[PDB]
Amino acid sequence: XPLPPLP
Amino acid sequence: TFVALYDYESRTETDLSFKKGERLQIVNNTEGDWWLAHSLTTGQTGYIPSNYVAPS
């Protein structure tokens, strides 16, 4: 229990 | 059987890091943006970011 910066 | 749209670099000991094109068995994907996947290559478990993976 933020997602990563998609490429 | 999902696919990691991109190599995911996990940072905690809960999620595992995968590569782009790698296949991971999805386990629980109803909690939020993080599901528990299982690498079939070696045989380990580690959550995964849904934005870096896709349903194939």
Side-chain angles (χ1 to χ4, degrees):
Chain A
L3 289 143
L6 266 177
Chain B
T1 325
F2 271 35
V3 182
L5 292 173
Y6 318 100
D7 315 76
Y8 166 57
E9 39 170 77
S10 99
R11 293 134 176 283
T12 160
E13 263 178 32
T14 26
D15 321 66
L16 278 164
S17 0
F18 40 73
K19 280 208 230 182
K20 178 232 220 171
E22 187 151 61
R23 313 217 265 196
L24 299 109
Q25 223 194 152
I26 291 303
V27 187
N28 227 339
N29 55 14
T30 186
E31 192 83 82
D33 297 70
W34 285 95
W35 316 329
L36 185 70
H38 165 75
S39 297
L40 301 161
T41 315
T42 184
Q44 284 213 112
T45 285
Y47 272 66
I48 47 127
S50 92
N51 69 334
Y52 266 55
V53 54
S56 168

Coordinates of all heavy atoms in Angstrom, one line a residue, unseen atoms left out:
Chain A
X1 N 1.0 -4.4 0.0 CA 0.0 0.0 0.0 C 0.3 1.4 0.0 O -0.1 2.1 0.9
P2 N 2.0 4.6 -5.3 CA 1.9 5.3 -6.6 C 2.5 4.5 -7.7 O 3.6 3.9 -7.5 CB 2.6 6.6 -6.4 CG 3.6 6.4 -5.2 CD 3.1 5.2 -4.4
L3 N 1.9 4.4 -8.8 CA 2.5 3.6 -10.0 C 3.7 4.4 -10.5 O 3.8 5.6 -10.3 CB 1.5 3.4 -11.1 CG 0.4 2.4 -10.6 CD1 -1.0 2.8 -11.1 CD2 0.8 1.0 -11.1
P4 N 4.6 3.7 -11.2 CA 5.8 4.3 -11.8 C 5.4 5.0 -13.1 O 4.3 4.9 -13.6 CB 6.6 3.1 -12.2 CG 5.7 1.9 -12.2 CD 4.4 2.2 -11.5
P5 N 6.3 5.8 -13.6 CA 6.1 6.6 -14.8 C 6.2 5.8 -16.1 O 7.3 5.5 -16.6 CB 7.2 7.7 -14.8 CG 8.3 7.1 -13.8 CD 7.6 6.0 -13.0
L6 N 5.1 5.3 -16.6 CA 5.2 4.4 -17.9 C 6.2 5.0 -18.8 O 6.5 6.2 -18.8 CB 3.8 4.4 -18.5 CG 3.1 3.1 -18.0 CD1 1.7 3.1 -18.6 CD2 3.8 1.9 -18.5
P7 N 6.8 4.2 -19.6 CA 7.9 4.6 -20.6 C 7.2 5.2 -21.8 O 7.6 6.3 -22.3 CB 8.5 3.3 -21.0 CG 7.5 2.2 -20.6 CD 6.5 2.7 -19.6
Chain B
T1 N -2.2 -15.2 -17.5 CA -0.9 -14.9 -18.2 C -0.9 -13.5 -18.7 O -1.5 -13.2 -19.7 CB -0.7 -15.9 -19.4 OG1 -1.3 -17.2 -19.0 CG2 0.7 -16.1 -19.7
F2 N -0.2 -12.6 -18.0 CA -0.2 -11.2 -18.4 C 1.2 -10.9 -19.0 O 2.0 -11.7 -19.1 CB -0.4 -10.3 -17.2 CG -1.9 -10.0 -17.0 CD1 -2.8 -11.1 -17.3 CD2 -2.4 -8.8 -16.6 CE1 -4.2 -10.8 -17.1 CE2 -3.7 -8.6 -16.4 CZ -4.6 -9.6 -16.7
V3 N 1.3 -9.7 -19.6 CA 2.6 -9.3 -20.2 C 3.1 -8.0 -19.6 O 2.4 -7.1 -19.5 CB 2.5 -9.2 -21.7 CG1 3.8 -8.9 -22.4 CG2 1.9 -10.5 -22.3
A4 N 4.4 -7.9 -19.2 CA 4.9 -6.6 -18.7 C 5.2 -5.6 -19.8 O 6.2 -5.6 -20.4 CB 6.2 -6.9 -17.9
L5 N 4.2 -4.8 -20.1 CA 4.4 -3.8 -21.2 C 5.9 -3.2 -21.1 O 6.4 -2.9 -22.1 CB 3.4 -2.6 -21.0 CG 2.0 -3.1 -21.2 CD1 1.0 -2.0 -20.9 CD2 1.9 -3.5 -22.7
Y6 N 6.4 -3.2 -19.9 CA 7.8 -2.7 -19.8 C 8.5 -3.3 -18.6 O 7.9 -3.8 -17.7 CB 7.7 -1.2 -19.6 CG 6.7 -0.6 -20.5 CD1 5.4 -0.3 -20.1 CD2 7.0 -0.4 -21.9 CE1 4.5 0.2 -20.9 CE2 6.0 0.1 -22.8 CZ 4.8 0.4 -22.3 OH 3.8 0.9 -23.1
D7 N 9.8 -3.2 -18.6 CA 10.6 -3.8 -17.4 C 10.2 -3.0 -16.2 O 10.4 -1.8 -16.1 CB 12.1 -3.6 -17.7 CG 12.4 -4.0 -19.1 OD1 12.2 -3.3 -20.0 OD2 12.9 -5.1 -19.3
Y8 N 9.6 -3.6 -15.2 CA 9.2 -2.9 -13.9 C 10.3 -3.0 -12.9 O 10.7 -4.1 -12.5 CB 7.9 -3.4 -13.4 CG 7.7 -2.9 -12.0 CD1 7.7 -1.6 -11.8 CD2 7.5 -3.8 -11.0 CE1 7.5 -1.1 -10.5 CE2 7.3 -3.4 -9.7 CZ 7.3 -2.0 -9.4 OH 7.0 -1.5 -8.1
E9 N 10.8 -1.9 -12.4 CA 11.9 -1.9 -11.4 C 11.3 -1.8 -10.0 O 11.0 -0.7 -9.5 CB 12.9 -0.8 -11.6 CG 12.1 0.5 -12.0 CD 13.1 1.7 -12.0 OE1 13.9 1.8 -12.9 OE2 13.0 2.4 -11.1
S10 N 11.0 -2.9 -9.3 CA 10.3 -2.8 -8.0 C 11.3 -2.2 -7.0 O 12.5 -2.1 -7.2 CB 10.0 -4.2 -7.5 OG 11.1 -4.7 -6.6
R11 N 10.8 -1.6 -5.9 CA 11.6 -1.0 -4.9 C 11.4 -1.6 -3.5 O 12.2 -1.4 -2.7 CB 11.3 0.5 -4.9 CG 11.7 1.2 -6.2 CD 10.5 2.1 -6.7 NE 11.0 2.8 -7.9 CZ 11.8 3.8 -7.8 NH1 12.2 4.3 -6.7 NH2 12.1 4.5 -8.9
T12 N 10.3 -2.3 -3.4 CA 10.1 -2.9 -2.0 C 10.3 -4.4 -2.1 O 10.5 -4.9 -3.2 CB 8.6 -2.6 -1.6 OG1 8.2 -3.5 -0.6 CG2 7.7 -2.7 -2.8
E13 N 10.2 -5.1 -1.0 CA 10.4 -6.6 -1.0 C 9.0 -7.3 -1.3 O 8.9 -8.5 -1.2 CB 10.9 -7.0 0.3 CG 12.4 -7.2 0.2 CD 13.0 -7.6 1.6 OE1 12.3 -8.3 2.3 OE2 14.1 -7.2 1.9
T14 N 8.0 -6.5 -1.7 CA 6.7 -7.2 -2.0 C 6.5 -7.4 -3.5 O 6.1 -8.4 -3.9 CB 5.6 -6.2 -1.5 OG1 6.0 -4.9 -1.5 CG2 5.2 -6.7 -0.1
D15 N 6.8 -6.4 -4.3 CA 6.7 -6.5 -5.7 C 8.0 -6.9 -6.4 O 9.1 -6.6 -5.9 CB 6.2 -5.2 -6.3 CG 5.3 -4.5 -5.4 OD1 5.7 -4.1 -4.3 OD2 4.1 -4.3 -5.8
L16 N 7.9 -7.7 -7.5 CA 9.1 -8.1 -8.2 C 9.4 -7.3 -9.4 O 8.5 -6.6 -9.9 CB 9.0 -9.6 -8.6 CG 9.3 -10.5 -7.4 CD1 8.7 -11.9 -7.7 CD2 10.8 -10.6 -7.2
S17 N 10.6 -7.2 -9.9 CA 10.8 -6.4 -11.1 C 10.8 -7.3 -12.3 O 11.4 -8.4 -12.4 CB 12.2 -5.8 -11.0 OG 12.8 -6.1 -9.8
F18 N 10.1 -6.9 -13.4 CA 10.1 -7.7 -14.6 C 10.7 -7.0 -15.8 O 11.1 -5.9 -15.7 CB 8.7 -8.2 -14.9 CG 7.7 -7.0 -14.7 CD1 7.6 -6.0 -15.6 CD2 6.8 -7.1 -13.6 CE1 6.7 -4.9 -15.4 CE2 5.9 -6.1 -13.4 CZ 5.8 -5.0 -14.3
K19 N 10.6 -7.6 -17.0 CA 11.2 -6.9 -18.2 C 10.1 -6.7 -19.2 O 9.0 -7.2 -19.1 CB 12.3 -7.8 -18.8 CG 13.6 -7.5 -18.0 CD 14.8 -7.8 -18.9 CE 15.8 -8.7 -18.2 NZ 17.0 -8.9 -19.1
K20 N 10.3 -6.0 -20.3 CA 9.3 -5.8 -21.3 C 9.1 -7.1 -22.1 O 10.1 -7.6 -22.7 CB 9.7 -4.6 -22.2 CG 8.7 -4.5 -23.3 CD 9.4 -4.5 -24.7 CE 8.8 -3.4 -25.6 NZ 9.6 -3.2 -26.8
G21 N 7.9 -7.6 -22.2 CA 7.7 -8.8 -23.0 C 7.7 -10.0 -22.1 O 7.4 -11.1 -22.4
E22 N 8.1 -9.8 -20.8 CA 8.2 -11.0 -19.9 C 6.8 -11.4 -19.5 O 5.9 -10.6 -19.4 CB 8.9 -10.5 -18.6 CG 9.1 -11.7 -17.7 CD 10.4 -11.5 -16.8 OE1 10.4 -10.6 -16.1 OE2 11.3 -12.3 -17.0
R23 N 6.6 -12.7 -19.3 CA 5.2 -13.1 -19.0 C 5.1 -13.4 -17.5 O 6.0 -14.0 -16.9 CB 4.9 -14.4 -19.7 CG 5.3 -14.3 -21.2 CD 4.3 -15.0 -22.1 NE 4.8 -16.4 -22.4 CZ 4.2 -17.0 -23.4 NH1 3.3 -16.5 -24.1 NH2 4.7 -18.2 -23.6
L24 N 4.1 -13.0 -16.8 CA 3.9 -13.2 -15.4 C 2.5 -13.7 -15.1 O 1.5 -13.2 -15.5 CB 4.1 -11.9 -14.6 CG 5.6 -11.4 -14.9 CD1 5.5 -10.1 -15.8 CD2 6.2 -11.0 -13.6
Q25 N 2.4 -14.7 -14.3 CA 1.1 -15.3 -13.9 C 0.4 -14.4 -12.9 O 0.8 -14.2 -11.8 CB 1.2 -16.7 -13.3 CG 0.2 -17.6 -13.9 CD 0.1 -18.9 -13.1 OE1 -0.9 -19.6 -13.0 NE2 1.2 -19.3 -12.4
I26 N -0.7 -13.8 -13.3 CA -1.5 -12.9 -12.4 C -2.1 -13.7 -11.3 O -2.7 -14.8 -11.5 CB -2.5 -12.1 -13.2 CG1 -1.9 -11.1 -14.1 CG2 -3.4 -11.3 -12.2 CD1 -0.9 -10.2 -13.3
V27 N -2.1 -13.2 -10.1 CA -2.7 -13.9 -8.9 C -3.9 -13.2 -8.4 O -5.1 -13.5 -8.7 CB -1.7 -14.1 -7.8 CG1 -2.3 -15.0 -6.7 CG2 -0.4 -14.8 -8.4
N28 N -3.7 -12.1 -7.7 CA -4.8 -11.3 -7.2 C -4.8 -9.9 -7.9 O -3.9 -9.1 -7.7 CB -4.6 -11.1 -5.7 CG -6.0 -11.4 -5.0 OD1 -7.0 -11.3 -5.6 ND2 -6.0 -11.7 -3.7
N29 N -5.8 -9.6 -8.6 CA -5.9 -8.3 -9.3 C -7.2 -7.6 -9.0 O -7.8 -7.1 -9.9 CB -5.7 -8.5 -10.8 CG -6.8 -9.5 -11.3 OD1 -7.8 -9.7 -10.6 ND2 -6.7 -10.0 -12.5
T30 N -7.6 -7.6 -7.8 CA -8.9 -6.9 -7.4 C -8.7 -6.0 -6.2 O -9.6 -5.6 -5.6 CB -9.9 -8.0 -7.1 OG1 -11.2 -7.4 -6.9 CG2 -9.5 -8.8 -5.8
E31 N -7.4 -5.8 -5.8 CA -7.2 -4.9 -4.6 C -7.1 -3.5 -5.1 O -7.7 -2.6 -4.6 CB -5.9 -5.3 -4.0 CG -5.7 -4.7 -2.6 CD -6.5 -5.5 -1.6 OE1 -6.0 -6.5 -1.1 OE2 -7.6 -5.1 -1.3
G32 N -6.2 -3.2 -6.1 CA -6.1 -1.8 -6.5 C -5.2 -1.8 -7.8 O -5.4 -2.5 -8.7
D33 N -4.3 -0.9 -7.9 CA -3.4 -0.8 -9.1 C -2.2 -1.7 -8.9 O -1.2 -1.6 -9.6 CB -2.9 0.6 -9.3 CG -4.1 1.5 -9.5 OD1 -4.9 1.7 -8.6 OD2 -4.2 2.0 -10.6
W34 N -2.3 -2.6 -7.9 CA -1.1 -3.6 -7.7 C -1.6 -5.0 -7.5 O -2.4 -5.3 -6.7 CB -0.4 -3.1 -6.4 CG 0.4 -1.9 -6.8 CD1 0.0 -0.6 -6.5 CD2 1.8 -1.8 -7.4 NE1 1.0 0.2 -6.9 CE2 2.1 -0.5 -7.5 CE3 2.7 -2.8 -7.8 CZ2 3.4 -0.1 -8.0 CZ3 3.9 -2.4 -8.4 CH2 4.3 -1.0 -8.4
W35 N -1.2 -5.9 -8.4 CA -1.6 -7.3 -8.3 C -0.5 -8.2 -7.9 O 0.7 -7.9 -8.2 CB -2.2 -7.7 -9.6 CG -3.1 -6.7 -10.2 CD1 -3.8 -5.8 -9.5 CD2 -3.3 -6.3 -11.6 NE1 -4.5 -4.9 -10.3 CE2 -4.2 -5.2 -11.7 CE3 -2.8 -6.9 -12.8 CZ2 -4.6 -4.7 -12.9 CZ3 -3.2 -6.3 -14.0 CH2 -4.1 -5.2 -14.1
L36 N -0.7 -9.4 -7.4 CA 0.4 -10.3 -7.0 C 0.7 -11.2 -8.2 O -0.1 -12.1 -8.5 CB 0.1 -11.1 -5.8 CG 1.3 -11.9 -5.3 CD1 2.4 -11.0 -4.8 CD2 0.9 -12.9 -4.2
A37 N 1.8 -11.0 -8.8 CA 2.1 -11.9 -10.0 C 3.1 -13.0 -9.6 O 3.6 -13.0 -8.5 CB 2.8 -11.1 -11.1
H38 N 3.3 -14.0 -10.4 CA 4.2 -15.1 -10.1 C 5.1 -15.4 -11.3 O 4.7 -15.9 -12.3 CB 3.4 -16.4 -9.7 CG 4.3 -17.6 -9.8 ND1 5.3 -17.8 -8.7 CD2 4.5 -18.6 -10.7 CE1 5.9 -19.0 -9.1 NE2 5.5 -19.5 -10.2
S39 N 6.4 -15.1 -11.2 CA 7.3 -15.4 -12.4 C 7.4 -16.9 -12.6 O 7.7 -17.6 -11.7 CB 8.7 -14.8 -12.1 OG 8.6 -13.4 -11.9
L40 N 7.2 -17.3 -13.8 CA 7.3 -18.8 -14.1 C 8.7 -19.1 -14.5 O 9.1 -20.3 -14.6 CB 6.3 -19.1 -15.2 CG 4.9 -18.8 -14.8 CD1 4.0 -18.7 -16.0 CD2 4.4 -19.9 -13.9
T41 N 9.5 -18.1 -14.8 CA 10.9 -18.4 -15.2 C 11.7 -19.1 -14.1 O 12.2 -20.2 -14.2 CB 11.6 -17.1 -15.5 OG1 10.8 -16.2 -16.3 CG2 12.9 -17.3 -16.3
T42 N 11.8 -18.5 -12.9 CA 12.5 -19.1 -11.8 C 11.5 -19.7 -10.8 O 11.6 -20.8 -10.3 CB 13.3 -18.1 -11.1 OG1 14.1 -18.7 -10.0 CG2 12.4 -17.0 -10.4
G43 N 10.4 -19.0 -10.6 CA 9.4 -19.5 -9.6 C 9.3 -18.7 -8.4 O 9.4 -19.1 -7.3
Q44 N 9.1 -17.4 -8.6 CA 9.0 -16.5 -7.4 C 7.8 -15.7 -7.4 O 7.1 -15.7 -8.4 CB 10.2 -15.5 -7.4 CG 11.5 -16.3 -6.9 CD 12.4 -15.3 -6.2 OE1 12.6 -15.4 -5.0 NE2 13.0 -14.4 -6.8
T45 N 7.4 -15.0 -6.4 CA 6.2 -14.1 -6.4 C 6.5 -12.7 -6.1 O 7.4 -12.4 -5.4 CB 5.2 -14.7 -5.3 OG1 4.6 -15.9 -5.8 CG2 4.1 -13.6 -5.1
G46 N 5.8 -11.8 -6.7 CA 6.0 -10.3 -6.4 C 4.9 -9.5 -7.1 O 4.6 -9.6 -8.2
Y47 N 4.3 -8.6 -6.3 CA 3.3 -7.7 -6.9 C 3.8 -7.1 -8.2 O 4.9 -7.3 -8.6 CB 2.9 -6.6 -5.9 CG 1.9 -7.1 -5.0 CD1 2.2 -8.2 -4.1 CD2 0.6 -6.5 -5.0 CE1 1.2 -8.6 -3.2 CE2 -0.4 -7.0 -4.1 CZ -0.1 -8.0 -3.2 OH -1.1 -8.5 -2.4
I48 N 2.9 -6.4 -8.9 CA 3.4 -5.8 -10.2 C 2.4 -4.6 -10.5 O 1.2 -4.7 -10.2 CB 3.3 -6.8 -11.3 CG1 1.9 -7.5 -11.2 CG2 4.4 -7.8 -11.2 CD1 1.2 -7.5 -12.6
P49 N 2.9 -3.6 -11.0 CA 2.2 -2.4 -11.4 C 1.3 -2.6 -12.6 O 1.8 -3.0 -13.7 CB 3.2 -1.3 -11.7 CG 4.5 -2.0 -12.0 CD 4.4 -3.5 -11.4
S50 N 0.0 -2.5 -12.5 CA -0.9 -2.8 -13.6 C -0.6 -1.9 -14.9 O -0.9 -2.2 -16.0 CB -2.3 -2.5 -13.2 OG -2.7 -1.2 -13.5
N51 N -0.1 -0.7 -14.6 CA 0.2 0.2 -15.8 C 1.4 -0.3 -16.6 O 1.5 0.0 -17.8 CB 0.5 1.6 -15.2 CG 1.8 1.6 -14.5 OD1 2.3 0.5 -14.0 ND2 2.6 2.7 -14.4
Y52 N 2.2 -1.1 -16.0 CA 3.4 -1.7 -16.8 C 3.1 -3.0 -17.3 O 3.9 -3.7 -18.0 CB 4.6 -1.8 -15.9 CG 5.4 -0.5 -16.0 CD1 4.9 0.7 -15.8 CD2 6.8 -0.6 -16.3 CE1 5.6 1.9 -15.9 CE2 7.6 0.5 -16.4 CZ 7.0 1.8 -16.2 OH 7.8 2.9 -16.3
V53 N 1.9 -3.5 -17.1 CA 1.5 -4.9 -17.6 C 0.2 -4.8 -18.3 O -0.5 -3.8 -18.3 CB 1.3 -5.8 -16.4 CG1 0.3 -5.2 -15.4 CG2 0.7 -7.2 -16.9
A54 N -0.2 -5.8 -19.0 CA -1.5 -5.8 -19.8 C -2.0 -7.2 -20.0 O -1.2 -8.2 -20.0 CB -1.2 -5.2 -21.2
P55 N -3.3 -7.3 -20.1 CA -4.0 -8.6 -20.2 C -3.9 -9.1 -21.7 O -4.4 -8.5 -22.6 CB -5.4 -8.3 -19.9 CG -5.6 -6.8 -20.1 CD -4.2 -6.2 -20.1
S56 N -3.2 -10.2 -21.9 CA -3.0 -10.8 -23.2 C -3.8 -12.1 -23.4 O -3.7 -12.9 -22.5 CB -1.5 -11.1 -23.5 OG -1.4 -11.8 -24.7

